[PDB]
Amino acid sequence: LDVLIVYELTPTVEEKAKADTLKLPPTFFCYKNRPDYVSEEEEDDEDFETAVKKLNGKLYLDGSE
């Protein structure tokens, strides 16, 4: 009555099993459950300096995103 847990973000059995195997937090793979998520194809060819260029010098959010 004093304090109660109504909700926790929880993965499926499968996601938690994968996290547990790698010793990652339970909620690690929950990004795959995002509506954006593309079940993406792409291999990683992208180097460090490109990733840096891709920032365009903008290091912080302005709230306009």
């Binding site: 004093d2 304090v3 109660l4 847990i5 109504v6 909700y7 926790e8 973000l9 929950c30």
Partner: protein, 79 residues
């Protein structure tokens, strides 16, 4: 003494939502969060509005609201 939903958002991505009485001190919720997550209250710290929260503090006393999120931080020190 009516109820608010407070979310506790951990650095590891977890979120634990508590239903808590507005006049209840947060030391209760902190303890329950540590018990749930398996940490010690000295091994981490709690923050709302970017300000560190006392055990003493009350949600109304801190002017909280529904779905207002509390942030947890892992303690660390340089060396």
């Amino acid at each position: 003494n009516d109820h608010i939903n407070l979310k506790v958002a951990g650095q590891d991505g977890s979120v634990v939502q508590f239903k808590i009485k507005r006049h209840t001190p947060l030391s209760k919720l902190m303890k329950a969060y540590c018990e749930r997550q398996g940490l010690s209250m000295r091994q981490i710290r709690f923050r709302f509005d970017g300000q560190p929260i006392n055990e003493t503090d009350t949600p109304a006393q801190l002017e909280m609201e529904d779905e207002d999120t509390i942030d947890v931080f892992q303690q660390q020190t340089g060396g």
